[PDB]
Design a protein around this ligand. Sequence first.
Ligand SMILES: Nc1ncnc2c1ncn2[C@@H]1O[C@H](COP(=O)(O)OP(=O)(O)OP(=O)(O)O)[C@@H](O)[C@H]1O
Ligand SMILES: Nc1ncnc2c1ncn2[C@@H]1O[C@H](COP(=O)(O)OP(=O)(O)OP(=O)(O)O)[C@@H](O)[C@H]1O
Lengths: 428, 428, 395, 394
Amino acid sequence: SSKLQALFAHPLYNVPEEPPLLGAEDSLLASQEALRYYRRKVARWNRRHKMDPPLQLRLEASWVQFHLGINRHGLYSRSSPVVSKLLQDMRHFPTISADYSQDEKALLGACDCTQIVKPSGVHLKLVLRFSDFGKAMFKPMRQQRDEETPVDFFYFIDFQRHNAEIAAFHLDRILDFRRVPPTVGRIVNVTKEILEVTKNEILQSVFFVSPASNVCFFAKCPYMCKTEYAVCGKPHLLEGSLSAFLPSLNLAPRLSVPNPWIRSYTLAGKEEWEVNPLYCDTVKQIYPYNNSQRLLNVIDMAIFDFLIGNMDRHHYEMFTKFGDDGFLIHLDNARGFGRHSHDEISILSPLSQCCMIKKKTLLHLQLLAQADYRLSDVMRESLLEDQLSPVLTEPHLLALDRRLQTILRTVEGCIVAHGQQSVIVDGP
Amino acid sequence: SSKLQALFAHPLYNVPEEPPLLGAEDSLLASQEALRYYRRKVARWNRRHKMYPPLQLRLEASWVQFHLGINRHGLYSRSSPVVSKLLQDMRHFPTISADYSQDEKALLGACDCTQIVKPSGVHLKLVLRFSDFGKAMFKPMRQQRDEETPVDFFYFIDFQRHNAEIAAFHLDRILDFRRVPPTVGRIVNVTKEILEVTKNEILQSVFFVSPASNVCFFAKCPYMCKTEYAVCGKPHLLEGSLSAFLPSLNLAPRLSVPNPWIRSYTLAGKEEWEVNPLYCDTVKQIYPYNNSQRLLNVIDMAIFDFLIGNMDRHHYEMFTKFGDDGFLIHLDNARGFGRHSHDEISILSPLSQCCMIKKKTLLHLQLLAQADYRLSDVMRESLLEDQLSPVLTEPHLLALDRRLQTILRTVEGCIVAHGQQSVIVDGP
Amino acid sequence: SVLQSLFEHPLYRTVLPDLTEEDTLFNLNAEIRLYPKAASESYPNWLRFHIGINRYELYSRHNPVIAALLRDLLSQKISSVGMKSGGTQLKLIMSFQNYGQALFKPMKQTREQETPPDFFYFSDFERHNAEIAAFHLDRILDFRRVPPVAGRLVNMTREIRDVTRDKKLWRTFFVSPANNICFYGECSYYCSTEHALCGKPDQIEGSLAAFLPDLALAKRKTWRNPWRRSYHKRKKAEWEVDPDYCDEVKQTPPYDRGTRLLDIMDMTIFDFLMGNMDRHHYETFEKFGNDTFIIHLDNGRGFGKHSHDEMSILVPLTQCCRVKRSTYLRLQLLAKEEYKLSSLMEESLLQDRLVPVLIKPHLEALDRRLRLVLKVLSDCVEKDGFSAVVENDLD
Amino acid sequence: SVLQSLFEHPLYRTVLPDLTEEDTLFNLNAEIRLYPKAESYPNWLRFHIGINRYELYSRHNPVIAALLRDLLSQKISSVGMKSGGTQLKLIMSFQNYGQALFKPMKQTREQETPPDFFYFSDFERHNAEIAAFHLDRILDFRRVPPVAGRLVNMTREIRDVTRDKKLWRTFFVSPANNICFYGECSYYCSTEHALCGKPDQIEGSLAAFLPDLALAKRKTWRNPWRRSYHKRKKAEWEVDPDYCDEVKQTPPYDRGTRLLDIMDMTIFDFLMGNMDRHHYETFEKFGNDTFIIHLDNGRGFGKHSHDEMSILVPLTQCCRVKRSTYLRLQLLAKEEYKLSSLMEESLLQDRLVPVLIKPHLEALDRRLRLVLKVLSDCVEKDGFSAVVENDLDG
Ligand SMILES: Nc1ncnc2c1ncn2[C@@H]1O[C@H](COP(=O)(O)OP(=O)(O)OP(=O)(O)O)[C@@H](O)[C@H]1O
Ligand SMILES: Nc1ncnc2c1ncn2[C@@H]1O[C@H](COP(=O)(O)OP(=O)(O)OP(=O)(O)O)[C@@H](O)[C@H]1O
């Protein structure tokens, strides 16, 4: 019984990862410096709201240990008890504050109803704070479970599903990629846990009551352009997805790098890779993809996006401390899991055209194809530990299996054209 | 004294024109047929106006004699006493009716403020009827005398000056082209002679009173788009240009032919002739320009437009009875005479590139360059016979002389490359 | 049979009073002078429709043109298409081979769909279903205050895109990943990519509301409804706090005469039968005076909810409590099983190249909303009495 | 010297009464919470926090002086077109996260509005916006947001720094090889009103941005003397000569501060000739006891050989003014002080001089003496104390 337990007890999910970690220089957050910075922000926070005892910054907090636990090998540890507590905290800890987050806010204005692909700042998302001082990016429910992105919808106008942000985390955990931030689902009292804790005068202005007597709120710019609707509770209850916050950019700077396989983000027109099957022959000769180690990380990201159907991966972020060989952060996955009946093979273009995959990645994929640890069953079980279960409908779960075959078929398919020499990179 | 009398008493303006006219088939209007049709329209007018002594259709009327006097050799006769009466009648006869004219009206709607080059139907022009039953196209005053089309103004947004329609007629008369309809200037009581005689419910609605207590009216579409203003009297008196009406299209059908040298009518982009100096080598091999007689009439039209600076000659109309060799009608010249300091040589592109001019046309141009019959003086005097004198300011008149040199220099200039063989066409 | 019998009733043959040249709108010889020279009663149906607009009705009871005018819109060739400006949602202007024109509201939403409960009245969709349904509803009540509208399956390639010189409308014609053609236009409400109207693959469906005569020779007054919703979240409205509102509004200059008030009553009953709570304005005809009907325009906001009866529309009637006896006897007659509304409405709505224009729940709700209007008249005539609630019209 | 002496008068040192946390606009700590993570705060912030119940800015503030300097020379970060307005007005964003409204040149200095133009057809010109700020400053009203004029480059400061698809698609080059743009507003936003430089400099005014309406809500009141904005059709105040006796019975006009505030404004509008004052905003969080923000002043300074007396009708029908302003208006009529020499002084400190052609500077005194005479011709028919309400007690 329990295919999930068998997966992590497999010799694959237990062998040491090479190269090993010397410490200090392989943990992006320095212990003494980070605790001081978070201690100042607790001091600075305790006033602003004062203008019950004050906040206490404890090392035993979940987000604190999560931030100090980010190493060169990924965001979290393999079968980490820290993340298990972190997920449980974001589900139960009460909220103390709500804001509009950056990425917005810095837009100042800025609504252009003519702009078809308005920037990623005019999207409905908040940043919440809990009693342990930690933060999490809140994405509300925007679609039912048995609902797909309707045909006639381009990728840039696709929705922002909360349940995809959750499932993207579990898939990250099952693949042992360990690159997306932990994410849980939670039912929120939008009045008591969002409105009554926000100090932002704008955010209070977007809360109204429906003719059905429901507490609703909306994104300021999309509501003005009438491109989206509001998000109502029933009448206060609304479910969402909290994604644990990465460390502060003052402690761990990040670098948004544009993907080499961006889309046109237009009603017409295709990019170079969309038309030239020899696109990767050029990519392999451009820095920093000449080291043949950054390209492999993009291949994994392609696999992860194809599994969830995330066409919208224009940029991937990296931690600057880890260098060109550093792993990629798969931050905003809220668009995947929208088409359970369609598989977009253009997402798999990096693997299709470059034709090379990491040794470790291929072994985990082959293993997840066997019925004893098949990808649909281990996901179905892992997602049951969330308050929003079922987070994925049945067509979505089974789709992972079929999309997994397509990945394996492409590997063995283009092995015939290059051999296991140039299609398997068993680097340490 | 009087260089104008010297011009028409010169042997050039007195030699018989070849071929001579046999009659009947060389008068576009058949006498018995035209008199019957015009008599019915007078009968129908007396009925329909009574419902809203009666009119008498006399053969001795100016427009009637003008219409039956249009021959294969032009619109009117050389030094015709009819035209002298026709001009005097349109200046003094009272108005009995005013409408919106066709070309508009058939727009039904039709205001698209996004359209930069809206059709030639959304322009302020009315059709007036006089006591002798004749009609005339009224163009109101839209600019002062000492005012130019300001720089940054494309041709398609240039104004619609009344004094240009008049001066274009006198230049037609002075050149002995005899192709534009007769045009006089007249001061109009816009209340007594337009508003109080219109049966059109829309025309009554566009009349208002200014804060300065002036009777004003406007074009419905351009005022809505705020592209132009209204035209006010002081407070009722307003000057305009009445252009004699051509015969009814039921009696003399016409054929709007597109110019071979149209402009792009866009904020950018050039036509083929604008870039290819060998453009006319193509035109000479396209029907009906292969007979080398229609092309000559287009050359004259270019000369006439260059002298006045009328860039907006997209279409030229022809009488279908006269065939491919028939003369061209220079109908709407309201745009010329706007730049007295600038000469637009692109208008002269037909003569520049084709390099051939009619024998008769060249002799009249050469004659008009000599001080005894110079073009500015004979125009200045001929324009004195108009109530709107001075219809052309001094810089405009002197410009005609200078632009004439450019035409003559162009003839002799490209004569050196082709000789008097292919640059003078002394057809009969 | 039912519709045949309804017009055969003695409550539907009441002729209008005599007329007078002062009761005509404009002298026919003056509208034909506004149109081009063109290319005894062989005038197009849209013209016979215009000259028939008199002081009382907008069209005779059983006109042969109003029937034929609907047929023209169904099948006449589209000449030019242009986008209107300044309106709430997207509405296109059609011009036909016979110089007639009409307003066009597209599909926008399906039949079995309901307006979300969390949508304000000023967020509801304008649907072609309502426009067509309103005309037959108004015709069935013998009000004759709506312009005739008929539904048509239009081709978005040859009847929309390829016959418009509108730079704004045309630049939004894109092809979707489902290989369907879509366009959204450039209005203000739901005019963006994410609300694009698409066919499968190139037929879109919509309604053609006939064009009222040109405002130049038929100026239309525009009056503000005293029960106009505040059109603002949170902020309430006057009629939502004073239960005696009507006792103050029956003192205003134009509502203590007429015909008026009664006209509003005939309208607020209409809007309640549809659920159209977007009635903030009612136009008139100026050249007539304060003694005419109200043109029921922009009906596209009705028929959005079939499981819900928005009682707020009835408040004009519950506060004023008076109706036209002509309409009271009709509304009673339209609730009987031999006549009724559903069987009368599905009859006439069946004669349109768009049936079923109304899913069955809406047709049956018509009887449900009608009996509530009938009951509000009953519950109030016991508190104010007859003769003081019903005003005699016939004799 | 002239300006030096004016602020040295004892009529310009009258401090406001004391304040209270209820008279501040918002807790500064809550406006820094609306902007990104980024008294060393930028000048546009010191300007925002200083907006109290009475003045919009202190008399001789060191920031209001420097705030004008920032708009003159600070780097343009983002440019966006505003929607819903009458004419074209652009939103500018700067390197210091500050923003401002921008109205371009549109018309020259020596030009006059055609006599046949309705009040709702006049141009909105940068001349009026900049002049209105100094005019209001000279009268010590301090009800206008600071505005400064700038020679902007339409290539690097307009076209190449906007992601607005509507605004950019109108940038064409004219037959004079000049760069032009018109935008997509509603009045004079077409090719035939295109704004062009010679060859690529356009000129305009930068009106500082009032604080965000989220934490500084602004009421919007309808002027009781608002013109009908419709040809032929007259207006109420143009037929009842006792209109003011009915408008001083309305709920908010038989208290205040109000009526008097309108008077301080209607005198302002007459000095400029701005007959487009149909709305006057407030600040909501204060109540019915505050000043009126004099916004959208671009329609003034259109006619110098003409004095539009229709603007004065609020004063000729109400006949009452604030004693503070009456003594000032008299003081601003003496040859040692006066308006022209005081107005060309401060207007000389702008990278746009001459912002006002000399006829307008001189007409300023002519409109002032008619206002002063209307006060005199009426104080003889209603008497002092019932025409002037003492406010200077303190
Ligand atoms: N799980 C996540 N999903 C999506 N985005 C994330 C996630 N975690 C972090 N981010 C992004 O990282 C950014 C964090 O920067 P932010 O402005 O919050 O700095 P900070 O950590 O708050 O610094 P300080 O401690 O100085 O306030 C956010 O704007 C957010 O968009
Ligand atoms: N002098 C002129 N300048 C410019 N356009 C002219 C001139 N004379 C006539 N036209 C054009 O010729 C057309 C005349 O056709 P119109 O519709 O007037 O028919 P009609 O001659 O009145 O025939 P009917 O007698 O049947 O009414 C008009 O559209 C007008 O634009």
